[PDB]
């Protein structure tokens, strides 16, 4: 509707019998391939991302957001548990970090 991309701003300017809009938009530029999975098995649980994508750089699995590559370790804060491992197609096996474990190991 306002510029090709994700719209940020628009600036109006006058013109003879008209108006000129300067649309400031966001365009993703430099791309990268990744190996992805919908959910992660962990102790019979199917962890899904709260917001972002499960990706892998070949060895480890991280979670990012969709429009920008920013990998983070998969914990229980950015994932939620729903169902078991026997339903979702394409699930993979990986561990999920728990921040409460070093606090309870004191």
């Amino acid at each position: 509707f306002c510029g090709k991309g994700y719209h940020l701003m628009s600036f109006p300017q006058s013109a003879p019998h008209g108006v000129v809009f300067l649309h400031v938009t966001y365009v993703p530029a430099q791309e990268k391939n990744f190996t992805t999975a919908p959910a992660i098995c962990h102790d019979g649980k199917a962890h899904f991302p709260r917001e972002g994508v499960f990706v892998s750089n070949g060895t480890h699995w991280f979670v990012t957001q969709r429009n920008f590559y920013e990998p983070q370790i998969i914990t229980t804060d950015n994932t939620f548990v729903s169902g078991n491992c026997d339903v979702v197609i394409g699930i993979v096996n990986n561990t999920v970090y728990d921040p409460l474990q070093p606090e309870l190991d004191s």
């Binding site: 090709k4 991309g5 019998h17 938009t25 992805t36 994508v53 920008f68 590559y69």
Partner: protein, 50 residues
């Protein structure tokens, strides 16, 4: 015969995704007309010339 565009093929797979690692800020220009000339015609003088 005109060219529709450059042919491209998306490297689709059921376990592969592409995520951007950088961005750019694009400011484009769009021109829209709003008004035009307000003409007025003297009907009798145009037809008859006084």
């Amino acid at each position: 015969t005109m060219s529709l565009g450059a042919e491209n093929s998306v490297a689709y797979s059921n376990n592969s995704i592409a995520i951007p690692t950088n961005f750019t800020i694009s400011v484009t220009t769009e021109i829209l007309p709003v008004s035009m000339t307000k003409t007025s015609v003297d009907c009798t003088m145009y037809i008859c010339g006084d």
